[PDB]
Symmetry: C2
Subunit: 307 residues, 2 copies
């Protein structure tokens, strides 16, 4: 037989499956009205991809060379890992850590040089919040979705990175409107209600550093006069899931979607996502704080049930 909690989880999954809840990424060829977006996607916590939605001048123009020419060879913040897994699991001396990227400043031209050097470490630029570049985007074009959130973005992120930079599976407390400018992004998505199918562990936290001789290593993170820090993190690799180690993952129904230059992906709050991309892909995305209702509380309960 099954335990009470197991039967309850089985009910949740069976009901979602029969009702096709979060069982696909809706695909649209035209931008919906704000009311359509609110009814069909925001209110249903349902992801959607709109093809060739944006005609921003950035799309088809922005490249690393174009950005160097447009903004000069200025110093930007860059993230570096030896393995391509910033905010990702990696082992050292027999111990598995959740590892943060090495963050540094370097000149855009040097970033371009290291992007052209796959014998070297994996790099990507990230910028969170430009008179030469604000002209190339029209944020108001996303109003059709923003009107469901009825608030300005918490954050606007710019990403430009190596094809080897993989973002391991996580979720965010934001509504995410994701716009690819150049190249393509590959998303693996898992709906929140399938949490019981996604194994999670508790891991010592580390950060990448380079030794005096240039070798990468993992430095554990410690608080002032105190012990090691820990992070809960998804432990499955959606590209190579170990179903012997994580049989429950066999019951997940991951969704795969490719977002091209000019496409918009609405990634709803608390959806698990794992992200890859083409080489020198460029993207911008908009994070809005979520509006709490009973789904968040049910998700917290689901967390308690799967601990």
């Amino acid at each position: 037989s099954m335990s009470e909690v197991e039967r309850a989880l089985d009910v949740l999954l069976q009901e979602a499956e029969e009702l096709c809840i979060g069982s696909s990424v809706v695909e649209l060829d035209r931008i919906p009205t704000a009311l359509e977006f609110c009814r069909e996607f925001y209110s249903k916590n349902q992801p959607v991809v709109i093809r060739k939605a944006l005609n921003w001048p950035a799309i088809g123009k922005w490249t690393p060379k174009y950005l160097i020419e447009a903004l000069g060879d200025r110093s930007v913040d860059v993230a570096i890992t030896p393995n391509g897994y910033a905010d990702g699991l990696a082992t050292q001396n027999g111990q598995e850590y959740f590892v943060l990227p090495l963050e540094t400043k370097m000149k855009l031209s040097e970033v371009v040089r290291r992007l052209d050097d796959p014998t070297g470490a994996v790099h990507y630029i990230q910028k969170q919040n430009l008179p030469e570049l604000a002209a190339d985007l029209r944020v108001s074009d996303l109003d059709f979705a923003q009107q469901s959130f009825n608030k300005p973005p918490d954050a606007v992120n710019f990403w430009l990175g190596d094809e080897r930079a993989v973002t391991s599976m996580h979720k965010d407390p934001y509504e995410n409107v994701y716009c690819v400018i150049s190249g393509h992004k590959d998303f693996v998505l898992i709906p929140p209600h399938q949490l019981s199918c996604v194994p999670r562990g508790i891991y010592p936290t580390g950060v990448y550093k380079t030794s005096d001789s240039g070798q990468f290593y993992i430095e554990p993170l410690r608080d002032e006069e105190g012990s090691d820090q820990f992070t809960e993190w998804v432990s499955v690799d959606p590209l190579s899931p170990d179903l012997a180690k994580y049989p429950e993952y066999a019951r997940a129904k991951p969704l795969k979607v490719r977002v091209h230059a000019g496409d918009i992906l609405y990634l709803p709050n608390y959806w698990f996502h794992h992200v890859s991309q083409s080489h020198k892909c460029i993207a911008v995305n908009f994070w809005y704080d979520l509006d709490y209702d009973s789904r968040y509380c049910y998700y917290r309960m689901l967390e308690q049930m799967t601990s």
Copy 2:
């Protein structure tokens, strides 16, 4: 405690810290379609709009004008001895969930019975002429666009003050419009299911004898098997907290809906309903569009039983 109980405690603590479903929002002006979808539908959040509707029917519609308009047609009416149609009642030391006595009656006789304080409790309930012109259903478009489909049911209700609707839930989005008088709702949010005691009761129906006496007649299925119904056990108006201490953690909401007011009652919200004498109301039921919230609620049902 058990794992299930700790899970339910986590749920309730989170919802209480966020005050999910802690009040019925009050509007003095009909919102836009987009406002309604974003603030209320997508949040499974009730809302009452004051003096929203100016239909001719508001103010005019009373039993006398109705008799005039329909030529005293014979209507289907529900009768109970206690005023609790679809409600619990004891007979022979056993507690049944009782359906109403369903009969046919001239509107004039219904009006006469409503005026009898010593008589049984009557109410007219009619579910789908010159009356259609007294309404303007398109005025509810602001809500219908969130449902994106025509009403799956439209109900008319005219009733005695003693008719009380015991606490229950519906799998419908409900747009409730009071025509004459007022309705009093007690609401409990779905996520508080574990605070609402429910029991399994044998099904029964009210019937009158040859001498005019109400009794409870058991029901059965196709065979002679006894029929059962799950039903909320607590009386919100005077809850037995000794027998049902968990209900102390529920936080019911009281709202009075006057003539011209609109109440949006979201799907699966518990509601207990009273009304003023000869109250008239019309409501619109829309089948729900299943999302993850419904599946969470089905899980919650499995856990609390």
